[PDB]
Amino acid sequence: RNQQLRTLQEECDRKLITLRDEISIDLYELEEEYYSSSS
Amino acid sequence: AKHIFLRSRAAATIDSLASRIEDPQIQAHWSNINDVYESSVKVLITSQGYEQICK
Amino acid sequence: VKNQIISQPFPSLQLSISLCHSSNDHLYVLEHNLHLLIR
Amino acid sequence: NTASLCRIGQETVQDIVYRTMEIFQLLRNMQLGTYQDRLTKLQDNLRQLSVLFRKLRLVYDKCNENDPIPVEQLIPYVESEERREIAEVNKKLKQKNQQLKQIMDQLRNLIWDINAMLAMRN
Amino acid sequence: STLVDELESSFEACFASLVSQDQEEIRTGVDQCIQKFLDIARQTECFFLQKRLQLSVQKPEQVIKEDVSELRNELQRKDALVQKHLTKLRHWQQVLEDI
């Protein structure tokens, strides 16, 4: 039961890593969209 | 707790800078990878039109 | 007092730590990390 | 309107100048089947160069079609309803900047939550 | 007057170093063409500095036309991203219920 749940732990780690990266990309895109305006 | 509070205080200072001073432009960027105690952030205050020259 | 660690780290800052014993505003990251600290 | 055309003329002059340095940058990469790609690339580059030359001649005639008033009126000596639209939309775009500012502040709180997750993940 | 012509005159002079049918001519030839070519270019800027400052001070309307023109083009690109952002916002919806 140890490695079986550790595989799910690492799968969720990869999922949260991808979500964090994708999100951060959206945040930087929004930031440079605001900077595209003269502000 | 001191690390979180000091990051919040730095955020408060940079938000005061952003809201008070919008003249050149304000840019704040943060490292995507961080330590538990120390961080590394980038602050840019560069003019409105010719930022690519004043490097 | 009984379950209340009232801490004053800074002269302009103070925080409460409570054993909420329900016997059935808040930051979760500290105790969520503390679980891994004791693990 | 004509000021926008003069700005377009200035930017097309910059376009030809950047075109000149990019031609000198591209041609200096080759000295003496890889040769065919570079020459086709430079042929497309000079085709676009000729198109840019003719279009700057066109916009130069377009900006030179109208000038009677000469220079030295330009030195600043010390001795209608579109303005309502400008005044009303300036504070709307400022309000939009603030409305996205609170949103990105909430995202800042989210990213300060998420950077501590990997900090003590192990 | 005819300032493009002496500008484009220096263009084929820039080819004089390149096209033909001991190094000292080459360093001079690639120089004085270019230094006069940056001469002939920076004055067009100051000529353009003259021409649109003429348009800046002789009339105030082409100033505010281009001021509206830059903010409308900012008004779209502001709106261009936010419901793009919103559609994107809808994207990590189903990305996150995968567990």
Q: What are the phi and psi torsion angles at E95 (to 5°)? A: -65, -30
Q: Which of C13, C29, C30 sits opposite B5 (nearest CB)?
A: C13
Q: Which of E41, E66, E82 sits opposite D3 (nearest CB)?
A: E66
CB D73 within 8 A of CB E54: yes
Q: Comparing C-alpha atoms, which of E18, E3, B40, C2 is closest to residue D20?
A: E18
CA D24 to centroid of chain Cα atoms = 22
Q: Comparing C-alpha atoms, which of E61, B14, E63, E14 is closest to residue D21?
A: E14
Burial E57-82 (b: 16+ CB within 10 A, else e): eeeeebeebbebeebeebbeebeebb
Q: How far apart are the first and last CA of chain B?
A: 36
Interchain pair A12, E99: CB under 8 A? yes
Interface test with B, best of D102, D113, D115, D118 (most B CBs within 10 A): D115
Give ∠ CA E85-E89-E95 in degrees, rounded to 5.
140
SS3 string of D51-113? HHHHHHHHHHHHHHCCCCCCCCCCCCCCCCCHHHHHHHHHHHHHHHHHHHHHHHHHHHHHHHH
| Contact B/A (≥3 CB pairs under 8 Å) | yes
Interchain pair B22, A39: CB under 8 A? yes
CB D74 within 8 A of CB E54: yes
Which residues are within 8 A (CB) of A28 and not within 5 positions of it... i.e. 6 or more apart?
B29
Radius of gyration of chain D from Cα atoms? Answer: 26
Q: Nominal resolution in Å?
A: 8.2
The pair of structure tokens assigned to E58 is 């002789």
In chain A, the residue whose alpha carbon lies closest to the alpha carbon of B21 is A39
| Contact A/D (≥3 CB pairs under 8 Å) | yes
> What letter would DSSP give residue B19?
H
Q: Is C33's Cβ below 8 Å from some Cβ in D?
A: yes
Beta B27-30 vs B41-44: how paired, if at all?
Answer: antiparallel
Q: Comparing C-alpha atoms, which of E10, B53, E7 is closest to residue D13?
A: E7
H/E stretch holding D15 reads helix D2-27
CA distance D119 to A20: 14
CB E44 within 8 A of CB E3: yes
CA atoms within 13 A of residue C38's CA, in its CB half-sphere: 5
Q: What are the phi and psi torsion angles at C19 (to 5°)? A: -85, 95
Q: Could you tell me the maximum CA-CA distance found in chain B, to the nearest angstrom? A: 41
Burial class of residue A27 in the structure, from the number of CB atoms within 10 Å of its CB (0-12 exposed, 13-18 middle, 19+ buried): middle
D57-61, long-range: CB < 8 A, 24+ apart: D57/E4, D59/D5, D59/D8, D59/D9, D59/D12, D60/D9, D60/E4
CA C33 to centroid of chain Cα atoms = 12
Burial D38-66 (b: 16+ CB within 10 A, else e): eeeeeeeeeeebeeebeebeebeeebeee
CB A11 within 8 A of CB E80: no
> What CA–CA distances, in Å, run from B2 to C5, C35, D69, E66?
17, 20, 67, 50
Q: Is C38's Cβ below 8 Å from some Cβ in D?
A: no
The pair of structure tokens assigned to E71 is 């903010």
CA distance D3 to D9: 10
In chain D, the residue whose alpha carbon lies closest to the alpha carbon of A24 is D111
Q: Comparing C-alpha atoms, which of E66, E54, B49, E37 is closest to residue D63?
A: E54
The pair of structure tokens assigned to D32 is 């003496």
The pair of structure tokens assigned to A24 is 């951060």
Distance from CA of C24 to the nearest CA of D (A): 30
The pair of structure tokens assigned to D2 is 């004509």
Please name the method used to determine this structure: cryo-EM
CA distance D1 to E66: 7
Interchain pair A29, E74: CB under 8 A? no
Q: Which of D7, D82, D89 sits opposite E64 (nearest CB)?
A: D82
H/E stretch holding D25 reads helix D2-27
The pair of structure tokens assigned to A1 is 């039961």
> What CA–CA distances, in Å, run from D80 to A1, B30, E61?
77, 45, 9
> What CA–CA distances, in Å, run from D36 to A37, D41, D43, D47, D48?
44, 9, 11, 16, 18
Q: Residue C6 pairs with which residues in a beta bridge?
A: C16
Interchain pair D100, A30: CB under 8 A? yes
Q: Which residues of C touch B1 (CB under 8 A)?
A: 9, 15, 30
CA distance E29 to D59: 31
CA D46 to centroid of chain Cα atoms = 22
CA distance B26 to B28: 7
In chain C, the residue whose alpha carbon lies closest to the alpha carbon of D118 is C33
Interchain pair C15, B2: CB under 8 A? no
The pair of structure tokens assigned to D38 is 């570079």
The pair of structure tokens assigned to E57 is 């001070």
CA distance D105 to D102: 5
CA distance D113 to B7: 12
Q: Which residues of A touch B22 (CB under 8 A)?
A: 39
Give ∠ CA A27-A30-A35 in degrees, rounded to 5.
125
The string of DSSP codes covering C2-38 is -SEEEEEEETTEEEEEE---------SHHHHHHHHHH
Please name the residue ranges forming H helices in chain E. 3-16, 24-58, 61-89, 91-96
Residues 71-100 of D with CB under 8 A from E: 71, 73-74, 76, 82-83, 85-86, 89, 93, 96, 100
